[PDB]
Design an enzyme around this catalytic site. Structure first.
Site, PDB file in Angstrom:
ATOM      1  N   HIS A   9       0.847  -1.189   0.000  1.00 16.24           N
ATOM      2  CA  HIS A   9       0.000   0.000   0.000  1.00 16.24           C
ATOM      3  C   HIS A   9       0.878   1.232   0.000  1.00 16.24           C
ATOM      4  O   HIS A   9       1.780   1.377   0.832  1.00 16.24           O
ATOM      5  CB  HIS A   9      -0.908   0.043   1.227  1.00 16.24           C
ATOM      6  CG  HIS A   9      -1.903   1.170   1.202  1.00 16.24           C
ATOM      7  ND1 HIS A   9      -3.170   1.034   0.667  1.00 16.24           N
ATOM      8  CD2 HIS A   9      -1.805   2.460   1.609  1.00 16.24           C
ATOM      9  CE1 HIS A   9      -3.806   2.192   0.754  1.00 16.24           C
ATOM     10  NE2 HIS A   9      -2.998   3.073   1.317  1.00 16.24           N
ATOM     11  N   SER A  26       0.649   5.439  -0.289  1.00 13.55           N
ATOM     12  CA  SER A  26      -0.167   6.642  -0.235  1.00 13.55           C
ATOM     13  C   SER A  26       0.686   7.797   0.255  1.00 13.55           C
ATOM     14  O   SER A  26       1.727   7.592   0.883  1.00 13.55           O
ATOM     15  CB  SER A  26      -1.344   6.442   0.718  1.00 13.55           C
ATOM     16  OG  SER A  26      -0.891   6.305   2.055  1.00 13.55           O
TER      17      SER A  26
END
Ligand SMILES: CCCCCCCCO[C@@H]1O[C@H](CO)[C@@H](O)[C@H](O)[C@H]1O
Ligand SMILES: CCCCCCCCO[C@@H]1O[C@H](CO)[C@@H](O)[C@H](O)[C@H]1O
Ligand SMILES: CCCCCCCCO[C@@H]1O[C@H](CO)[C@@H](O)[C@H](O)[C@H]1O
Ligand SMILES: CCCCCCCCO[C@@H]1O[C@H](CO)[C@@H](O)[C@H](O)[C@H]1O
Ligand SMILES: CCCCCCCCO[C@@H]1O[C@H](CO)[C@@H](O)[C@H](O)[C@H]1O
Length: 257
Positions: free
Chosen positions: A130, A132
C-alpha cells in the site's frame, strides 16, 4: 547473511529486539530537480515559492512477524518504506515538506537457493503493498498492489524483479498504471566496495516510465557517500504523471547489497 538477501537476513535472529532489519535502501541526499511540479501542488499556499532544490530521504525497514510460518527459511514479515521530499532550504516558507510516500508491506517470504547457470535465486517474496501520500484531496494519491519480489545474484551482480497486480481503489489516480507499468527491475553491480545500482519501471505499452541510477562508496563500515540521478515519470506519487530529472548527493546506510 548472503549479501543483499532481505529474507535470509530477516531469518538471522537479533539479540536486541530494537535492532531492526533493513528492507530497501536507507539514505538522505540533497537534490536539485529539473522541473518542480507546481501544477499538482497548486493547492498549497507555498506552491508559488516552491524551489527545485530539495532534501530527499528514504527510510526502509522490515519486521519478521513469524519465522518458519511455512517451513524453515520462511517468514511472514512486514516492511515500512518512506520517501520524503523536503523544501529544507525554502526558509521563506518555513521549510515545508512537499511530499511524503508511506509504503507498508505485508508478505510471505522465503530464503532460497535455485541455480540459474551461475545465478542463485535467493529471495522469493509475495505480499500486499500500500502506497499513499497521506494527503487530503485534491493532492491526495494512493494505490494498492499484490506483488512478488524475486532476487538473484551472480558474483558482482544483483538482479531483482518485482511484478505486481493492482487491487483496491485507484480513484486518486486511476491512470497510474499508464506511468508506472506492471513491474520494477533493479540491478546492482559491486565494483569492490563501490556499488552501482539501477532501479526502474516502464510500461511497454504506453512508453512512459522512470529510471534511477546510483553509485555509493563506504565512508565507514555503516555509512556511505551516495550519488543519485532519477529521470522520468513516477518519482513520487504526486509526480506519478509528471516528468523530471533529479540529481542528488548525500549519505546512505545500506545499499541494495
Ligand atoms: C522529521 C519530521 O517528520 C516529517 O514530518 C512531516 C510533517 O508533515 C511529514 O509530512 C513527513 O512525512 C515526516 O517525515
Ligand atoms: C513459488 C513459491 C515459492 C517457492 C519457494 C518455497 C521455498 C522452498 O524451498 C526451496 O526448496 C527447493 C526444493 O525444490 C530447494 O532447492 C531450494 O533451495 C529451497 O529454497
Ligand atoms: C502471498 C501472501 C499474501 C500476504 C499479504 C496479505 C494480504 C492481506 O491484505 C488484504 O488483501 C486483499 C487482497 O484481495 C485486499 O482486498 C484487502 O483489502 C487487504 O487488506
Ligand atoms: C519472472 C518474470 C516476471 C517478469 C514480469 C513482467 C510482466 C509484465 O508484463 C506485462 O503484463 C501485462 C499483463 O498481461 C501486459 O498487459 C503488458 O503488456 C506486459 O508488459
Ligand atoms: C553497468 C555495470 C557494468 C559492469 O560491467 C562489468 O565491468 C567489469 C569491470 O570492468 C568487467 O570485468 C565485466 O566484464 C563487465 O561485465
Amino acid at each position: 547473511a548472503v549479501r543483499g538477501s532481505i529474507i535470509a537476513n530477516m531469518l538471522q535472529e537479533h539479540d536486541n529486539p530494537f535492532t531492526l532489519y533493513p528492507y530497501d535502501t536507507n539514505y538522505l541526499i540533497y537534490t536539485q530537480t529539473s522541473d518542480l511540479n507546481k501544477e499538482a501542488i497548486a493547492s498549497y499556499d507555498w506552491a508559488e515559492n516552491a524551489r527545485k532544490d530539495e532534501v530527499k530521504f528514504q527510510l526502509s525497514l522490515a519486521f519478521p512477524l513469524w519465522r518458519g510460518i511455512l517451513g524453515p527459511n520462511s517468514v511472514l514479515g512486514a516492511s515500512y518504506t518512506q520517501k520524503s521530499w523536503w523544501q529544507l532550504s525554502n526558509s521563506e516558507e518555513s521549510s515545508p515538506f512537499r511530499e511524503t510516500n508511506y509504503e507498508p508491506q505485508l508478505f510471505l517470504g522465503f530464503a532460497t537457493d535455485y541455480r540459474f547457470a551461475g545465478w542463485t535465486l535467493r529471495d522469493v517474496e509475495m505480499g500486499y503493498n500500500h502506497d499513499s501520500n497521506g494527503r487530503s484531496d485534491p493532492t491526495s494519491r494512493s494505490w494498492a498492489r499484490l506483488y512478488t519480489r524475486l532476487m538473484a545474484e551472480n558474483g558482482n551482480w544483483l538482479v531483482e524483479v518485482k511484478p505486481w497486480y493492482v487491487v483496491g481503489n485507484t480513484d486518486d489516480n486511476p491512470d497510474i498504471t499508464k506511468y508506472m507499468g506492471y513491474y520494477q527491475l533493479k540491478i546492482g553491480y559491486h565494483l569492490g566496495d563501490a556499488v552501482l545500482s539501477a532501479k526502474g519501471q516502464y510500461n511497454w505499452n504506453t512508453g512512459y516510465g522512470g529510471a534511477e541510477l546510483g553509485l555509493s562508496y563506504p565512508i565507514t563500515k555503516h555509512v556511505r557517500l551516495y550519488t543519485q540521478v532519477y529521470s522520468g515519470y513516477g518519482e513520487s506519487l504526486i509526480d506519478y504523471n509528471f516528468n523530471q530529472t533529479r540529481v542528488g548527493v548525500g549519505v546512505m546506510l545500506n545499499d541494495l547489497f
